[PDB]
Amino acid sequence: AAELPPLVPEPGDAGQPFPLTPTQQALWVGGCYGYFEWERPELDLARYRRAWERLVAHHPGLRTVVRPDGTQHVLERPGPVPITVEDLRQDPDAVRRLEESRLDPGTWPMFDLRVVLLSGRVRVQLGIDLQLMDASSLFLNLFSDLVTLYDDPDAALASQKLAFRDFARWLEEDVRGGARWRADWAYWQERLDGLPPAPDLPAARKFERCMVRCPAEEFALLRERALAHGLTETELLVGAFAEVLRGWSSDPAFTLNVPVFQRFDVPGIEDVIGDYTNPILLEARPEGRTVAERIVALAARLRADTRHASVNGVEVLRELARRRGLAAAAMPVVVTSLLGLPSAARSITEFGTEVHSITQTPQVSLDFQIRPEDGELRLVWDHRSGAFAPGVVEGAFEAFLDLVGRMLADEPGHGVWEAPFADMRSRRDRAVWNETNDTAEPVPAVLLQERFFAQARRTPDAEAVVASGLRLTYDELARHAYRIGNTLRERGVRPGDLVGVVMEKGWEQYAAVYGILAAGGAYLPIDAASPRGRVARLLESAGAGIVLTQSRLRDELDLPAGTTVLRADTDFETASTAPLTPVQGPDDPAYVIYTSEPKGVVVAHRGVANLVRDVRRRFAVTPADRLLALSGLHFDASVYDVFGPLACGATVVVPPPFRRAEPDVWAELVRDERVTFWNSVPVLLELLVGEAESRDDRPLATLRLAVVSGDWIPLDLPGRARAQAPGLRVVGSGGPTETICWSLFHPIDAVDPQWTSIPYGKPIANQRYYIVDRDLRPRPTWARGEMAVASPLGLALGYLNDPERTAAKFVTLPGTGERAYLTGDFGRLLPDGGIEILGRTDVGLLAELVAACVAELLGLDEVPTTGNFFRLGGDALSGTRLASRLQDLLGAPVPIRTVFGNPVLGDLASAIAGDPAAGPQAIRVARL
Amino acid sequence: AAELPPLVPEPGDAGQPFPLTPTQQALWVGGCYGYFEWERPELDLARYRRAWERLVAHHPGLRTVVRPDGTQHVLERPGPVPITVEDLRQDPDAVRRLEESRLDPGTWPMFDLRVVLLSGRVRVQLGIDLQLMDASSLFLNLFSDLVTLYDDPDAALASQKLAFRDFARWLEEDVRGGARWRADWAYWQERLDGLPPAPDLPAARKFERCMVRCPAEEFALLRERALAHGLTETELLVGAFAEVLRGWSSDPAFTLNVPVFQRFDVPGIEDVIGDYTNPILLEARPEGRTVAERIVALAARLRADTRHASVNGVEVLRELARRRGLAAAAMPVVVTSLLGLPSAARSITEFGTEVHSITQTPQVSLDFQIRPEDGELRLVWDHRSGAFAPGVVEGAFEAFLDLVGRMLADEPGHGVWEAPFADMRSRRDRAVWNETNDTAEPVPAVLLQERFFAQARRTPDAEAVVASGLRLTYDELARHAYRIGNTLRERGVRPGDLVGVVMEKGWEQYAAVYGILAAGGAYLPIDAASPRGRVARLLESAGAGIVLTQSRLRDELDLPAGTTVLRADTDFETASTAPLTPVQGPDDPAYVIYTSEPKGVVVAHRGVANLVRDVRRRFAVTPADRLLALSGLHFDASVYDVFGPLACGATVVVPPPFRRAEPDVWAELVRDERVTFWNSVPVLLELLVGEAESRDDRPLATLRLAVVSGDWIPLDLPGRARAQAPGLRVVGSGGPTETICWSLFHPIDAVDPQWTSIPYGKPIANQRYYIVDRDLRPRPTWARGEMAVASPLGLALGYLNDPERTAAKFVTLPGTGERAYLTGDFGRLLPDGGIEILGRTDVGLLAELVAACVAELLGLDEVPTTGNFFRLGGDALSGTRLASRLQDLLGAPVPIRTVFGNPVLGDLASAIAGDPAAGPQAIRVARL
Ligand SMILES: Nc1ncnc2c1ncn2[C@@H]1O[C@H](COP(=O)(O)OP(=O)(O)NP(=O)(O)O)[C@@H](O)[C@H]1O
Ligand SMILES: Nc1ncnc2c1ncn2[C@@H]1O[C@H](COP(=O)(O)OP(=O)(O)NP(=O)(O)O)[C@@H](O)[C@H]1O
């Protein structure tokens, strides 16, 4: 505490210009009018006007106006105070005509005074410009004097002992730059690059209120609760407010704007209407296991941050804004507390019952107002309508009352004080989420192959696989599966073995898949166009000592010699067609599909069973359907193509092997084989839909259902496709390889122009889509977090030969003990239950000069031009020497002001290089 | 002529700082030391030193040095003058050790004085800093005094009557800004946005000399020649210099830097060593039919430009540089003439025979020096080695002497004075061009089809077209041609008819092409994948009432009903195979190929004959060759594929029809059908070469010749392709559809790293590649112009049904009367005969305010912020009022200096907005 210089009241110039306070200068560039409307039965207008004429005269601030040149002075005689009266007594539905009635610092007055006469009651309206004074002068000086004076307009007022202009010059010239302000300015610059951004709350695609009053008895208890932790009521409420704000914020760490209204104990400043605001940038990083621990810790930082309040927060905002954006420096989440201030003589409530009031300040999104009134305690949140997603503020206010309520209910040391966290989802949040994720359905333990054989027996002569001028029937395909099945079984394939399938598009893939399952193994699809010896790299890695392939492709493949290779279309003609009795379990692996080391997603029959049975019921898949198997057997998307339609008697149309997209083919293949069911990543659908647009027929007309997923679904693609195919249902899906092909669905019926993406969807049978913060904890609606797909049967068993990565991505949600797969995808819950997918050079030499001098002065090896001087290690006594040694080295004056108002070393170089006083000299020395 | 204020010599401060002249300030930011070395037998060193000590004392300028702060003063006693002597008499090969000997304005002296004693002769060396004085003080003051004084070091010198510091303060403060300087500054600003860039001469990927002396008698005649046109010797030489410079420049219009050395007839300034340079930006736009007319006209502009020389050119360069780049404002082509100056008392030649001298000034590429010496006339070009393409300066100096010689030979009114232009190609230029374009070869009048039938008779059983598991033999293909031939003939096809060929890749195309020719018609290939009814749009347009197509593609085509459509593979089985006797001429059309209205390039048999016979001989095309017909029958590149290999017994491999690039196919097709000859646009070769790199075999190994063209040939593609195919000859070609497929060739043997493209090439038989300027006039080597392909048989006959566009692109070169096709391509001749292909917001409201006031003051509807005030219509008497009306409107002082030093209206706003004096006020008014 470096003692401050004294205030020398200069009454000679009481009306000679002075500067706006920093917090006033910010309001002068950015309407902003706080408003108040009280009601009472009678009002002696003559007495009331006598009161405001005495008021205007007593208080210099009420006679202060701002010149056009950006400064201000105190008019010595401004005029009679304007009080517009509006007679509204002979008007039915007058309160209607009253609310229908809906100001500048350049023209006196900076307030607006109206009275509105109605039947048997009157409405006092007072409008004030936010620059005129701060919130503490409003309540502690104006309101308490308006009440004294409307009582007795002649009553005695404590003598004005100094001018607000005396206090405002004292601040800029005797305080700003002094001993103390320099120590405190180092405090802030040491910290500034570490300050997190303002709270990142969810936004939409002017000012509302949320309010509660705490009665005297609950106010008293709230205070005991705070003191029990050595906290002030404001410390507790700021700490609870940050806990609530983390329910919705993107990052747990934000900066809150916490203005204090300190007048520095100047004698006589307790009665001086002026502007005393001093924003304080509170760093709010969660520090502690428990709620109580974190609140206490943040309270300690606010306390220390306030020990250095001789620097006005608006100066820290200026520096912060140089470093990052003007946007990236905005602190629009404010906690304005009028607690801890002298009690005033009269409360405005003594004058009229409040009826309306709105402080709608500019460049503030949400302002948590803490103010005492009538020994109750007002908790007000003024928020800017439009600044946040619908409900986010309302739902956070609920969370906040519930958290304060719980502090009132629970004894310090127990309950909420001890909790690791408070669940912040609203009743509606958990209602809508549970409704949407009540997806449990029993999955009959009928193995994947044994379902298709049953279908082969039911309709044996029906088209199974149509593929390049060859049409396998269901019996024909079931027979060849049994050949591969019997063969593989008698060549060593016990349950839980892997059998590679290295092939190109064609019937031989289905044969091999169902044959490997019939034998009891799991099928390992690998790309027949893998580079180098990747196919050997995977096969060796998975442990697949048998490979099934095509005749026409065997020699084109670099397979290791020890492994046996069979060709599904020739090496099997002499094997039995006798059905195989299944020997693997429903939870044994059905396939192992690789995803870029490359990791092997292991998947059981059960969870595929779940997906097939879900799609059949959800989309009405009948045998009359024909599905085009476009995706490749080594992509998760092919899993529905393999087991879906073949399990219900529908027909698989396999397209000719392709090395690049060929929509011309596919559109004709949709036309000739009368295809109903399309499944592909979105861009491939765009190509198809693009090819059809440039054609005179309607080649996609047979398409009834087109499910796209795996990438962003263009916003016009669903409408485009419904043209080239009337009555097409376009369904958007998603879900990683580890949640079994498709795990959620969004039927795209109509695209909202307000949307930025298609909604990701809602989860299928036996899937549950949590959005969770970085502690695996479900978040409220609109809050952004990682998607966690919970399911006891609809998740991959694990990563092949890799308990560790499996452990880390397939986790136990701590809230429920559910096993969930951590998708690494990020999205957020929509209000209707859906999910939105979200993602995942002469100065230059003077700066090198400044930085080298700074590196020597602090004792450091190297120091970067971008570095902030005080963060690099500089305090206030060593920031003085920096100005000294630069003066020496450059032969130019570098004033101490120039070193501090430019903490960033690049900024100081630019300040010296463009110094009129001695820039050019300093430029020359720089050039060595 | 607004009379100038007088000069008030201020001797009190003769040594008190003054500013650098503008032309000196430019030399202070940008080594620069002019050098002189004379030789004589004897030198009295004591007398010589006595001479330079008197010199230093007499001439303030020789004692002037530049402070570190960017100003200068006259030392009152600097010291004894340093003269380094180097004794070199007992040293064999001393002139060797002498030349081996190879200064700053901050340290006096700004010159360097050496003497070098050798056997029986001595070398006086004088080095001078270009800032010390200008070229006219060097010769007229220093050199003429060094000679007076080495004669008699005590001899009388005319008294110094004023200081150079008196003249340099007079200029900046009494002249710059005055009455005159304002009228002249309007002159330049009215003109400035119209000034063309400096001469754009060809560049490569420190100072040399070109020199001639004109003897007294030829100097005298040169003067009579100039006077005969009312021109001064400098006007004539500047005018001839620009004519020469246009031989090589990119644009006929350039700006030359023509400094004048005016001292303003101040009394006594004739003997004052200082810097008097005043660059003048001469706009050099060709104005006149004849050489004499253009020279006279430019002389008139230089004369007027000089009538406004109270503005120093360095100020015009500053403004010009604000508007365009710093680069875009550089005027590095200078004509520095010391003609028109007072004769001096003694010439430096009287002191020593010159032996070496080099004025190597910075930021000057080429400086044409015109100076008189001993009643001879020195013409010197100092150029910066490296600044231009090799030879360009040497070859332009030749052109310049030849043009001056011709003015000396020819009487005014005849010869060169009357010529439309002077051919500026060097003897080497026309030698190398003619050697390269001696391409005439007789083309036997053997029709295109009748050459293939002959080949069909010679080797009838050999492979003609191999195309998709069908191998037409030569007889088989010649038979089917005769079927289409006989049929078409007896269905109405008279010579000069067009027959469409709408097909996809396949043997049916060759059948149709040779059948249409056998019948006597021309074949019109149109894309079988044209959108909408383009195929009908072209067919209707060309006049092609027959179309040949494929069975498998007929119904896929929107052809008009009246036209007959036949299918080459079914509608022809019953027609005769009897040979047809040809009925069209060798110069009748062979085909009509369309190029995007769409224009139809008509092409005769003769010029295709030329290309086939050229490629066969140039590349050794034998029957063993197999060529892959990748290009499409509707692209000019297919013309070689159709007629080339089929005319010599080689085999055409046709690939399967493709809608996008499929290198995988093509590489296997090159492997299986053993392909030797590749022809495609470059990127397709890159794809092929890319596919082969990712393969374990060598699938392109059979490739012996790969000709790519139609687009830019990547610099690595030739080396890449020679790997995947050892012994491949990669040949780059080119030439538009109107010069018959390929009209020039560059065998790519090795790629120079200095290259930016592959050289376009040299022309094939019967082609001639001119580079010509905008008057169809062939240009010198490295000069950039449009390529004009001349040929009496190797050009399209014309554009179908379009005499007008044919007239305009198929022109008569005026130099030779040759018919040439104007490619619209731009390139330039290389020295080896080849061609290189070359291509083809508070200020914002103050500016709106300034511009509105300016629009009113000049009488104009709207005026743009970007507009220059004086070009928009402002003179000097109305630029004064602009400062007045802005002062009124803004309530801020706008000094007259601020309006003129900122002619651009945006610039003036910025000058007012950032005015410390009264910027903020002006900012406020701006915001309405
Ligand atoms: N509609 C959609 N919009 C945006 N992204 C989607 C959508 N549907 C699926 N995704 C993404 O697709 C991913 C699933 O892809 P997956 O089938 O696992 O192969 P991949 O992860 O993309 N390839 P890789 O992990 O490198 O082997 C998800 O993790 C999402 O990021
Ligand atoms: N090696 C090359 N480098 C650069 N450009 C080349 C090269 N070879 C040919 N060209 C260009 O190819 C053009 C000839 O193309 P052409 O065969 O006439 O069809 P196109 O003009 O490109 N298509 P269009 O005129 O729109 O119908 C020339 O005019 C050159 O610009």
**CA-to-CA distance for A118 and A673, rounded, in angstroms?**
80
Smallest CA–CA distance from B68 into chain A, residue: A924
Q: Which atom of ligand 1 is nearest to the CA of A682?
A: 1
Backbone angles phi, psi at B786, to 5 degrees: -80, 140
Name the CA radius of gyration of chain B, rounded. Answer: 37
Q: Are residues B213 and B292 in the same domain?
A: yes
Q: Does B927 touch chain A (CB under 8 A)?
A: no
Residues of B within 8 A of A924 (CB-CB) are: 68
Q: Are residues B795 and B847 in the same domain?
A: no
C-alpha distances out from residue A201 to A197, A364, A396, A587, Å: 11, 13, 11, 43
Q: Does A924 touch chain B (CB under 8 A)?
A: yes
Q: Indicate if ligand 2 lies below 6 Å from the C-beta of B825.
A: yes
**CA-to-CA distance for A810 and A824, rounded, in angstroms?**
11
Cis bond upstream, residue B259 (ω within 30): no
Q: Do A924 and B68 touch (CB under 8 A)?
A: yes
Interface test with B, best of A660, A687, A697, A928 (most B CBs within 10 A): A660
b/e sequence B900-924, b meaning 16+ C-beta within 10 Å: bbbbbbbbbbbbbbebeeebebbbb
Q: Does A920 touch chain B (CB under 8 A)?
A: yes
Residue A354 lies in a domain: yes
Q: Minimal Cα–Cα distance from A920 to chain B, Å?
A: 8
Compute the CA torsion angle B821, B823, B829, B834 (nearest 10 deg): -80
Residues of A within 8 A of B68 (CB-CB) are: 924
Residues of A within 8 A of B69 (CB-CB) are: 920-921
Residue from A716, A684, A685 nearest A703 by CA: A685
Compute the CA torsion angle B773, B776, B782, B783 (nearest 10 deg): -10
**CA-to-CA distance for A114 and A86, rounded, in angstroms?**
8
Helices B291-306 and B233-245 sit at what angle, rounded to 10 degrees? Answer: 120
Q: Residue A106 burial by CB count (10 A; 0-12/13-18/19+): exposed, middle or buried?
A: exposed
**A-proximal residues of B, 639-678, CB under 8 Å:** 659-660, 662, 664
Q: Which atom of ligand 2 is nearest to the CA of B840?
A: 31
Residue B759 lies in a domain: no
Q: Are residues A338 and A192 in the same domain?
A: yes
Cα A572 from chain centre: 58
Q: Which residues contact A446 (CB under 8 A, 6 or more apart)?
A: A586, A609
> How was this model experimentally determined?
X-ray
CATH code (residue A811): 2.30.38.10
CATH code (residue A158): 3.30.559.10
The tally of CA atoms less than 13 A away on the side-chain side of residue B669 is 23
Helical segments of B626-662, H only = 638-643
Specify the 3-state DSSP secondary structure of A185: helix
Residue of A760, A799, A805 to mutate, ligand 1, most atoms within 8 A of C-beta: A760
How many domains would you assign to chain B? Answer: 4
Which residues of A fall in the annotated binding site for AMP? Answer: 710-711, 733, 737, 825
**H or E, element range at B599:** strand B599-604
Q: Do A920 and B664 touch (CB under 8 A)?
A: no
**CA-to-CA distance for B490 and B572, rounded, in angstroms?**
13
Specify the 3-state DSSP secondary structure of B884: helix
Residue B402 lies in a domain: yes
Cα B352 from chain centre: 43
Quick check: B915 and B892 in contact, CB under 8 A?
yes
Q: Are residues A229 and A136 in the same domain?
A: no
Residue from B875, B877, B876, B864 nearest B904 by CA: B864
Cα B867 from chain centre: 29
Which residues of A fall in the annotated binding site? Answer: 710-711, 733, 737, 825
**CA-to-CA distance for A271 and A164, rounded, in angstroms?**
10
Q: Minimal Cα–Cα distance from A633 to chain B, Å?
A: 22
**CA-to-CA distance for B669 and B678, rounded, in angstroms?**
12
**CA-to-CA distance for A508 and A88, rounded, in angstroms?**
90
Q: Does B928 touch chain A (CB under 8 A)?
A: no
Residue B227 lies in a domain: yes
Q: Minimal Cα–Cα distance from A120 to chain B, Å?
A: 47
CATH code (residue B298): 3.30.559.30
Ligand nearest to the backbone CA of B823: 2
- What is the arrangement of strands in the sheet containing B589-595, beginning at the earlier edge strand? B564-567, B546-549, B498-503, B522-527, B589-595, B599-604, B798-799
| Cross-chain CB nearest to A660 (options B660, B920, B921) | B660
C-alpha distances out from residue B214 to B26, B237, B336, B372, Å: 33, 13, 17, 9
**CA-to-CA distance for A398 and A244, rounded, in angstroms?**
9
Quick check: A160 and A291 in contact, CB under 8 A?
no
Quick check: B565 and B554 in contact, CB under 8 A?
yes
Quick check: B273 and B142 in contact, CB under 8 A?
yes
Apex A821 CA angle, A678 and A808, nearest 5? 140
Residues of B within 8 A of A660 (CB-CB) are: 660, 662
Structure tokens at A641: 């193509």
Q: Which residues pair with B73 in a beta bridge?
A: B65
Q: Minimal Cα–Cα distance from A273 to chain B, Å?
A: 30
Q: Do B920 and A69 touch (CB under 8 A)?
A: yes
For chain A, the first-to-last Cα distance in angstroms comes to 42
**CA-to-CA distance for B499 and B547, rounded, in angstroms?**
6
Name the CA radius of gyration of chain A, rounded. Answer: 37
* Residue A635: Cβ within 10 Å count: 18
Ligand nearest to the backbone CA of B599: 2
The number of helices, as runs of H, and strands, as runs of E, in chain B is 29, 35
Residue B522 lies in a domain: no
Backbone angles phi, psi at A200, to 5 degrees: -95, 85
**H or E, element range at A612:** helix A605-619
Residue of A787, A809, A835, A837 to mutate, ligand 1, most atoms within 8 A of C-beta: A837
**CA-to-CA distance for B298 and B284, rounded, in angstroms?**
7
Residues of B within 8 A of A659 (CB-CB) are: 662, 664
Ligand 1 site residues (CB inside 6 A) read A 595-596, 636, 709-713, 732, 734, 736-737, 760, 823, 825, 837
Strands B798-799 and B810-812: unpaired
**CA-to-CA distance for A685 and A709, rounded, in angstroms?**
10
- Among protein residues, the one with the nearest Cα to ligand 1's atom 26 is A596
Helices B474-489 and B448-458 sit at what angle, rounded to 10 degrees? Answer: 140
Cα A422 from chain centre: 19
Q: Which residues contact B638 (CB under 8 A, 6 or more apart)?
A: B525, B629, B631, B632
Whole-number Å distance, alpha carbon A592 to ligand 1 midpoint, is: 18
End of a domain among B809, B839, B869?
B839
Structure tokens at A157: 């007022």
Cis bond upstream, residue A109 (ω within 30): yes
| DSSP notation for A779-831 | PPTT-EEEEEEE-SSSS-SEETT-HHHHHHHEEE-TTT--EEEEEEEEEEE-T
In residues, how long is chain B? 928
Q: Does A114 touch chain B (CB under 8 A)?
A: no
Smallest CA–CA distance from A532 into chain B, residue: B694
Residue from A399, A434, A437, A433 nearest A249 by CA: A399
**CA-to-CA distance for A629 and A670, rounded, in angstroms?**
11
Residue appearing with tokens 């007055």: A109
**CA-to-CA distance for B285 and A12, rounded, in angstroms?**
73
Helices A919-926 and A842-858 sit at what angle, rounded to 10 degrees? Answer: 80
Residue of B711, B743, B835, B836 to mutate, ligand 2, most atoms within 8 A of C-beta: B711
Specify the 3-state DSSP secondary structure of B687: helix
Count of A–B CB contacts within 8 Å?
A: 17
Residue A549 lies in a domain: no
**CA-to-CA distance for B486 and B578, rounded, in angstroms?**
8
Q: Are residues B805 and B850 in the same domain?
A: no
Quick check: B527 and B573 in contact, CB under 8 A?
no
Q: Do A664 and B659 touch (CB under 8 A)?
A: yes
Backbone angles phi, psi at B498, to 5 degrees: -110, 140
Secondary structure of A725-754 as H, E, C letters: CCCCEEEEEECCHHHCCCCEEEEECCCCCC
Compute the CA torsion angle A348, A349, A353, A356 (nearest 10 deg): 50
End of a domain among B399, B416, B433?
B416
Q: Are residues B264 and B396 in the same domain?
A: yes
The last residues before gaps in chain B (C-N over 2.5 Å) are: 30, 102, 205, 596, 840
Structure tokens at B443: 């083309």
- Among protein residues, the one with the nearest Cα to ligand 2's atom 9 is B710
**DSSP3 helix / strand / coil % (chain A, rounded to 5):** 35, 20, 45
Structure tokens at B145: 């005094």
Residue B554 lies in a domain: no
Q: Which atom of ligand 1 is nearest to the CA of A596?
A: 27
Q: Are residues A65 and A34 in the same domain?
A: yes
The number of helices, as runs of H, and strands, as runs of E, in chain A is 29, 35
| Cross-chain CB nearest to A659 (options B68, B70, B664) | B664
Residue type, A525: P
Q: Are residues A387 and A333 in the same domain?
A: yes
Q: Minimal Cα–Cα distance from A902 to chain B, Å?
A: 21
Secondary structure of B415-470 as H, E, C letters: HHHHCCCCCCCCHHHHHHHHHHHCCCCCCCCCCHHHHHHHHHHHCCCCEEEECCCC
Residue B175 lies in a domain: no
Q: Are residues A318 and A352 in the same domain?
A: yes
Q: Indicate if ligand 2 lies below 6 Å from the C-beta of B837.
A: yes
Q: Which atom of ligand 1 is nearest to the CA of A734?
A: 8
End of a domain among A779, A813, A839?
A839
* Residue A878: Cβ within 10 Å count: 15
For chain B, the first-to-last Cα distance in angstroms comes to 42
C-alpha distances out from residue B115 to B87, B121, B349, Å: 9, 11, 17
**CA-to-CA distance for B885 and B893, rounded, in angstroms?**
10
Q: Does A555 touch chain B (CB under 8 A)?
A: no
State which residues form the domain around B848: 842-926
Strands B729-734 and B705-708: parallel
Residue appearing with tokens 């470096």: A2
**CA-to-CA distance for A903 and A867, rounded, in angstroms?**
8
Residues of A within 8 A of B660 (CB-CB) are: 660, 662
Cα B22 from chain centre: 31
Helices B313-323 and B179-192 sit at what angle, rounded to 10 degrees? Answer: 40
C-alpha distances out from residue B689 to A529, A747, B335, B656, Å: 18, 46, 54, 19
Q: Are residues B834 and B847 in the same domain?
A: no
Quick check: A590 and A522 in contact, CB under 8 A?
yes
Q: Does A694 touch chain B (CB under 8 A)?
A: yes
Residues of A within 8 A of B664 (CB-CB) are: 659
Q: Do A664 and B664 touch (CB under 8 A)?
A: no
The last residues before gaps in chain A (C-N over 2.5 Å) are: 30, 102, 205, 596, 840
Q: Are residues B799 and B852 in the same domain?
A: no
**CA-to-CA distance for A734 and A740, rounded, in angstroms?**
10
Specify the 3-state DSSP secondary structure of B390: coil
b/e sequence B551-561, b meaning 16+ C-beta within 10 Å: eebbeebebee
b/e sequence A670-687, b meaning 16+ C-beta within 10 Å: bbebebbbbbbbbbbbbb
Q: Indicate if ligand 2 lies below 6 Å from the C-beta of B710.
A: yes
Ligand nearest to the backbone CA of B756: 2
Q: Are residues A830 and A864 in the same domain?
A: no
Helices A877-890 and A842-858 sit at what angle, rounded to 10 degrees? Answer: 130
Q: Which residues pair with A839 in a beta bridge?
A: A826
Residue type, B422: A
Quick check: B258 and B203 in contact, CB under 8 A?
no
Whole-number Å distance, alpha carbon B710 to ligand 2 midpoint, is: 4
Which residues of B fall in the annotated binding site? Answer: 710-711, 733, 737, 825
